[PDB]
Amino acid sequence: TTALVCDNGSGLVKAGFAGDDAPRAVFPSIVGRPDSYVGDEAQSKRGILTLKYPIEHGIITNWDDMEKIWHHTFYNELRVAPEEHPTLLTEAPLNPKANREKMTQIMFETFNVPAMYVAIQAVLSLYASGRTTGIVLDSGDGVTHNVPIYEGYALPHAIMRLDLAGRDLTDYLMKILTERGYSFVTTAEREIVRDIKEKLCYVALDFENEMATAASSSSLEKSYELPDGQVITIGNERFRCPETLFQPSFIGMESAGIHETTYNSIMKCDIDIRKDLYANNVMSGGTTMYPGIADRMQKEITALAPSTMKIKIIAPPERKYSVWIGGSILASLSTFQQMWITKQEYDEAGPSIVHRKCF
Ligand SMILES: CO[C@H]([C@H](C)/C=C/N(C)CO)[C@@H](C)C(=O)CC[C@H](C)[C@H](C[C@@H]1OC(=O)C[C@@H](O[C@H](N)O)C[C@H](C)C[C@H](O)[C@H](C)[C@@H](OC)c2coc(n2)-c2coc(n2)-c2coc(n2)/C=C/C[C@H](OC)[C@H]1C)OC
Ligand SMILES: Nc1ncnc2c1ncn2[C@@H]1O[C@H](COP(=O)(O)OP(=O)(O)OP(=O)(O)O)[C@@H](O)[C@H]1O
Ligand SMILES: [Ca+2]
């Protein structure tokens, strides 16, 4: 009867049981066809399968394939009967109301859960840091958000979204390396470049200075052993790739960078709470894992913020799993149990009960 927590991401599903300290199931958010394969099944049968991604920039957009992902989660990964477990699902900031209603309809009508809830991902990450007030930078495979939160609740009018995250950074590195004369095209090759990104990339504190260092010495060069044993060496690509988060123009996007969106979000909030936001900037998601990113954010926010405001960037080491962990905590609390949408409540009112019980 333990509650389930399923954190639905653009790139990865993280799922498990409330009270656990990490998700037991982490698998790609992919459905593959030459009947259909889900997750690891679809990844380790490379090439001959075309892939669909049911979650696009954080939002569920292919509902039938999303049902396959949920089926795979319950039955293949966790080995549970959904009808025996309250289930907490996560959603993106600013998820449409009709989307949350559809998630609810599916959980009750398709999976026959006894109870469910939908929580905002960035909010859960803040909780996982021990806070109810702060501003989260959540950046994953598909989307980046800035979400200011006060006394446990997101401030929707101040949320910012950037459709630039980990997959765009992998694609950019792939482009750079393809131009330098390497062959990286297939989905197996995408996996290699993702790995190079994750192992060798970092955020420069000062991008101009770092470009000058790389132009004058070999001290920033790092090597990477490909799957056949041949070696690739990169230098300034290491920091040019994630610099895109700060300078989206690198991939031809007109948007403000993540430091500017963070500041703009704080400036949309009541002046009386900004001190608390500046002192509680929490990073969440895999794309915040780059070495150097917290220090860079600290500098850039300091440049924009009023003088002497204490700026604090919190970068939890567990931040690849922060959203999930926040859900695990929330769903375990005694005070939360009154908050579940029960099947009875859903029968009484319908799927639109979700607006009165969730955000
Ligand atoms: C009830 O919800 C309301 C409101 C109605 C809902 C609003 N929305 C959803 C809005 O969108 C909301 C305002 C609110 O109260 C949310 C509260 C937050 C979930 C959260 C609650 C507190 O919860 C907390 O403050 C969370 C923090 O605990 C501590 N005690 O500070 C987490 C840590 C700092 C880090 C981890 O220990 C670390 C990451 C790691 O440690 C080994 C770890 C990984 O998994 C976990 N820990 C884990 C999984 O389950 C648990 N931990 C768990 C299960 O229950 C507990 N912990 C209980 C902890 C006691 C805490 O008090 C100190 C707990 C009350 O506070 C930030
Ligand atoms: N060490 C790392 N350095 C840089 N990027 C990383 C690292 N580890 C993981 N990533 C990237 O994090 C992304 C996955 O993060 P996460 O699980 O938070 O995203 P998601 O929830 O699937 O997506 P979204 O939140 O955008 O919908 C991938 O793009 C992955 O390459
Ligand atoms: Ca996510």
Curated annotation (Swiss-Prot):
Keyword vocabulary terms for this entry: Acetylation, ADP-ribosylation, ATP-binding, Cytoplasm, Cytoskeleton, Hydrolase, Methylation, Muscle protein, Nucleotide-binding, Oxidation
Designated gene of the protein: ACTA1
Reactions catalysed according to its record: ATP + H2O = ADP + phosphate + H(+)
Record's subunit section: Polymerization of globular actin (G-actin) leads to a structural filament (F-actin) in the form of a two-stranded helix. Each actin can bind to 4 others. Interacts with alpha-actinin. Identified in a complex composed of ACTA1, COBL, GSN and TMSB4X. Interacts with TTID. Interacts (via its C-terminus) with USP25.
Modification type ADP-ribosylarginine: residues: 161
InterPro entries, alphabetized: Actin (IPR004000), Actin/actin-like_CS (IPR020902), Actin_CS (IPR004001), ATPase_NBD (IPR043129)
GO biological-process terms attached to the record: actin filament bundle assembly; actin filament polymerization; mesenchyme migration; positive regulation of gene expression; skeletal muscle fiber development; skeletal muscle thin filament assembly
CDD domains documented for this protein: ASKHA_NBD_actin
Modified residues (N6-methyllysine): 68
E.C. code: 3.6.4.-
Organism: Oryctolagus cuniculus (Rabbit)
GO cellular component terms, A-Z: actin filament; actin filament bundle; cell body; cytoplasm; filamentous actin; filopodium; lamellipodium; skeletal muscle myofibril
One Pfam family hit: Actin
Region (Interaction with alpha-actinin): 94-107, 342-354
Remaining remarks: In vertebrates 3 main groups of actin isoforms, alpha, beta and gamma have been identified. The alpha actins are found in muscle tissues and are a major constituent of the contractile apparatus. The beta and gamma actins coexist in most cell types as components of the cytoskeleton and as mediators of internal cell motility.
The protein's name: Actin, alpha skeletal muscle
Subcellular compartments: Cytoplasm, Cytoskeleton
A Gene Ontology molecular function term of the record: troponin I binding
Superkingdom, natural source: Eukaryota
